[PDB]
Design a protein around this ligand. Structure first.
Ligand code: NAD
Ligand code: NAD
Ligand code: NAD
Lengths: 332, 332, 332, 332
């Protein structure tokens, strides 16, 4: 399928990387009004976190050509004006973070796009997480959400656990890497005052709707989960810390077996499993949504356990945006 | 009380600094075979995390002289050889990290000290946390532990919540600043392999008995709490994240009211309370054991809640070592 | 003299702190459209780099009240509309970074300000560095510039060395702490593409006019100096590295004596001297413009030498802004 | 040539990585008394800076097996007791950092090694830098040094500039990533007090003989260069800042040409050249010795210039150790 990307930010660039590495979808257009063609060459070629792109990146005849694939570049502030149908962009990845409602994201449909995948949570577009509920997608849905990086880490683990032992209730913390929303030194962030404080100097508490959101993609968990976040001074890779009460008793070793089995089966490539003595850098550019860390977690008793799973918040998620698009395309 | 300090390290120097700031005890001797006298001046005078010493420090005739007060200096590798009695040191702060059993810490009694305070959890020495069980200290105890920074944070909050609502069970996470046992780049770390990984690059999961230890200072909570830690790239200030089940129902506002009331009363100076939009740097050089963060926590229902409390792992703990020694001296 | 601040940022806030230590400067008004009154209370009170404010700060009756002094708060995007005259602001500190020319900074005069001090280099306003050319100010100048942090570090040193030995030519590197113009993760940065790359992850080369600008405040050095910068992952405190050819011969010991003699006499408070084994954090909240590090520099021979001088880019500069106002006020 | 590695650390491990990209060097033995066999598997497989090993690693029958090649593991503190001859190690890489003189590194010969390559400057073993003086090696030299990362960055650039324009005199600064010698928080470093201060909190000045050593590899530059370093909070990748006086005049674009020409011909893969808007992370895992940053440097005039070159201090140098062994083996 032919894909257009709106917003060549971290997620837009890394979706693009993922699409080219993988060969699965064809990027044919990109819109970004704040980043010109020659700057796009540079921002895609060099990446502080994931390294230099492999292959050619160049500007040719007002296009962005990556390994000889020419991509049409737009610079529209208003998504309605973007000529997606003319450029052959069938599916649009909406990655600006500012067009996340059905209302706003549907503006791509005017331009000729057939479907829009919001690379972020939505107030009202239906949400999907690969391995958890992506089967609920159907042909009538033109605007969908891939949820958040954190919900994509948590939901597959919650699913495995709930399925075998039943989650009565659960409280989540994510210790999350620095994001573009943050500031280098104490500066203004109007509404969210903690998020203005110097990012590399602080542990910063933040609220997050990721845990509640799991209750939408796994409806049996509706109301059973919530949580919060701490932003910490790393550039990428984050971790979920799920403290849950279980209905059926489970020895920790039973939890390990059942997660490892899910990682080898229906959730392969989505949920991983490790017993190694890992740290966050070992998940740099790792494509899983969630990788359970058997050694880091801890049980108080057979009904009350803390479970730990890692996620490359940029790269895991980006690959899932690609995989959702592949599924949607198979269902046309 | 006249105090000797074994080990001039983060904690050894900050205990010294807290003693000089507060005036609560008199430091009369320091032993550290790896820092010569002129190096001691330098290490005490300049501090990256807490700033220059406010006062004077110099070497004079073989003594370290702080604020004009001369301190006898020893250079002994074996604590059994430290002539504490010649210096007049009555209590000895055992702050090396390598003599934490009663048998090992008891060597200070051979050179003339009367009591020893181990500035770390001990496998076997009686453990005390100011504001929680310090009143159980008595004059028969010559060798005691002030527990860990993390225990000193968790225990006062745990006491308040258990006292009011009953903790049925809890799991703790501590998001913890980097420590001197870590490494700058990936290198060897004995049996704790994760701990050798480059400290400033990684979120590093770690074991801690600090939650279990709360059952030593609050026996009713024996077997009801455990936890783990994550080491992240900040130089100082850590946070406890406690997920607990309560016996009685408690609305989040009643929880706040009761913590705030404990902070103003018998735990004043130990347990703090804030509703401000704080981040970790706001507690740098803060002397509390634990500061409840009202806006950071979240409740799922009236019996399942996540409570957040901050702690200056260096300077809050150092001040508690000083406070315990004042309390001990009041019982002689 | 009564002062207004436009732009309540790192420099706006730190100028306000510094001013609360002088009888000669009173802050009476502040304008910042991205920080409402209750937000200012918070941004002023809490500071990741310099710690909590030691006086009182409150919002009371629509005013910002600091150490009992009520400050009028404005919220204008266009400095032409700010009613400084009404609030009694005679001098205005122009610290937004976006009005650095005479035309733009001159807007403040429409509202009744008498003089404007731009807290950055200006293309056309006369530039002053305290201890170097501040006596060239006269009371007909309504718009002036306090130059940059880097210029304020380099000029006093350059002056001492030129005055004693003559500098034939010099090339400067500054290794500079992260700032507000940088980005947390790889992001859009207009024409300065290097400045967009994640600030915590990188050493980032950057151009700086600061060494050239020394040829304005020391006209004999005109065209004899230039330089560049590297941005590095520290939150505050920067260092100048001056490699210069000297006209007369100077042994390194003579350079030291000469610099120290200046630090004790005419440039006391502006130019410091140390022989201690210092590192950047040792200058955090340090009010000097420049402190020569005697142990860090190195000479190739008597005419070719690398000289090293530290500067708290936030607080040293913020104190010079106050000091230039005090000097200007003395000339009224 | 079959090679053994003494000290399996950043350089030991990355040499080993680089050896496994070379059909001309076979690692057959590793000694490291602080890393047992199973820990070596972990330490080799996972790398925070350079990512997971792209190959296989396991322990089998007492040996470390990398990409199917079995390597004998020794656990000796005293290098004279290591049985290199018996394991078949002809060359030994001496990468502990504690055996750098001819006499100390000589110890490997007693256990049957034929030649020793010291991965660090030596007081008396002959120093080589690939592309500058490696052709001065001959088979009578059983103990050699590959100089330092910083010398390998500066010397190739200095050669090009000196050969074309002549360097009358030069002063170097290197802005260098953190290394294993540093500390995570302020701690003891008795010979080098600045180096004990918390590494991720500070810019730390440090002495370096690397500029002076360029005079041993380029005897015509003897006494004409010296320099110093700052250590800053990045995990890897460093930069040289060369301030030099030229005999013949050279416009900056003539400098660019000569350097670029050198990079395409005889110093290819050693000296790189870029005009891109690069920052440190763009050289992470880059195998060059020195990459000239055209945009970053600046000239005062035709005879006085500041030149910028980047280097991955870990990975470039490690590749050079391997390249030096290849060269030496070519002469046997
Ligand atoms: N830093 C914290 O956040 C913190 C908090 C609570 C408790 N603690 C505990 O405090 C203790 C010390 O911690 P630290 O962070 O100060 O470590 P540190 O590494 O900074 O200090 C240890 C000091 O002991 C010295 N030393 C080593 N061997 C010695 C010997 N045989 N005799 C005398 N001195 C010796 C070293 O030279 C060093 O100055 C540990 O038990 C640790 O668990 C630390
Ligand atoms: N931080 C340093 O190290 C340093 C040192 C010397 C000089 N300076 C200079 O001082 C100036 C400020 O730097 P900073 O580091 O405080 O930046 P900063 O981003 O912290 O502060 C900028 C402030 O100006 C405000 N602002 C933006 N537009 C405005 C407008 N139209 N009206 C009123 N306020 C507005 C912002 O809300 C912000 O609070 C710059 O010119 C900078 O070059 C900075
Ligand atoms: N890291 C760099 O950027 C860099 C660049 C160029 C050269 N070097 C040089 O290479 C050497 C090692 O540097 P590194 O950064 O890899 O340090 P490192 O601390 O990572 O490695 C040293 C290793 O030697 C081992 N070791 C200690 N004593 C030993 C003994 N007696 N026998 C065998 N092994 C022993 C340690 O366990 C460790 O694994 C030093 O000379 C250093 O100056 C380092």
């Amino acid at each position: 399928v032919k894909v257009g990307v709106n917003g060549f930010g971290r997620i837009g660039r890394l979706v693009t990387r993922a699409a080219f590495n993988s060969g699965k979808v064809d990027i044919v257009a990109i819109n970004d009004p704040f980043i010109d063609l020659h700057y796009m060459v540079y921002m895609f070629q060099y990446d502080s976190t994931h390294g230099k792109f492999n292959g050619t990146v160049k500007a040719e005849n007002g296009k962005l050509v990556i390994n000889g694939k020419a991509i049409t570049i737009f610079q529209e502030r208003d998504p309605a004006n973007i000529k997606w149908g003319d450029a052959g962009a069938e599916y649009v990845v909406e990655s600006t973070g500012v067009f996340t409602t059905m209302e706003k994201a549907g503006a791509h449909l005017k331009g000729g796009a057939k479907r829009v995948i919001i690379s972020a949570p939505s107030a009202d577009a239906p949400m999907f997480v690969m391995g958890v509920n992506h089967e609920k997608y159907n042909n009538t849905l033109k605007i969908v959400s891939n949820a958040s990086c954190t919900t994509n880490c948590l939901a597959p683990l919650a699913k495995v656990i709930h399925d075998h032992f039943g989650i009565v209730e659960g409280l989540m913390t994510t210790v999350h890497a620095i994001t573009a929303t943050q500031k280098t030194v104490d500066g203004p962030s109007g509404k969210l005052w903690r998020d203005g404080r110097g990012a590399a100097q602080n542990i910063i508490p933040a609220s997050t709707g990721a845990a509640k959101a799991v209750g939408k993609v796994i409806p049996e968990l509706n109301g059973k989960l919530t949580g919060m976040a701490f932003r910490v001074p790393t550039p990428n890779v984050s971790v979920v810390d799920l403290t849950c009460r279980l209905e059926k008793p489970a020895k920790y070793d039973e939890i390990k077996k059942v997660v490892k089995q899910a990682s080898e089966g229906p959730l392969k490539g989505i949920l991983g499993y490790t017993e190694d003595q890992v740290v966050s850098c070992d998940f740099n550019s790792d494509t899983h949504s969630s990788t359970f860390d058997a050694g880091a977690g801890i049980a108080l008793n057979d009904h009350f356990v803390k479970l730990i799973s890692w996620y490359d918040n940029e790269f895991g998620y980006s690959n899932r945006v690609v995989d959702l698009m592949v599924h949607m395309a198979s269902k046309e």
